[PDB]
Amino acid sequence: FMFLISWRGYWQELIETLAWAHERTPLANLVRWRDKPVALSIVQARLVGLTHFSVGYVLTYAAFLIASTSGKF
């Protein structure tokens, strides 16, 4: 639901702000990212939210079904 509701723009600004933080935090400027941190793309985060939705759906129902049948029979 997190990726489903919120969209790419709040996260990009937040990541830019955190990149500003790390690029000029003392004792951490020794290391730097090889790949520039960016927000997930719109299609990518739609896919990620869908994947989490399906995984949570399946895990929740499998847990409930197996518990409510095996614990009872």
Partner: protein
């Protein structure tokens, strides 16, 4: 920079104008005292190469597996201890 007034750009001095600074890094030879520096460079001599510092991680993972082989049971841990009866279940099962 040439920032004697309000001029913060200079192509002949483009190093300072871009913003590349040390912030806190300062150059100084004096820090660590004698004999101990040689002691520590001898302690970390041949290990500086990437392959041997990889081999240190290899023997670390060997220790990880040695815990599972003989080390988990030495600190007891319930996963290798004994068991106490059992439970039947909802109906006539086991």
């Amino acid at each position: 920079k040439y920032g004697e007034e309000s001029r913060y750009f200079d192509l002949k001095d483009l190093e300072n104008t871009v913003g590349s600074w040390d912030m806190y890094g300062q150059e100084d030879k004096s820090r660590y005292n004698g004999l101990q520096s040689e002691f520590f460079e001898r302690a970390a001599n041949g290990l500086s190469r990437r392959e041997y510092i990889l081999g240190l991680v290899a023997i670390g993972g060997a220790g990880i597996l040695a815990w599972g082989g003989k080390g988990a049971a030495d600190v007891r841990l319930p996963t290798v201890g004994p068991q106490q009866p059992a439970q039947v279940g909802p109906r006539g099962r086991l």
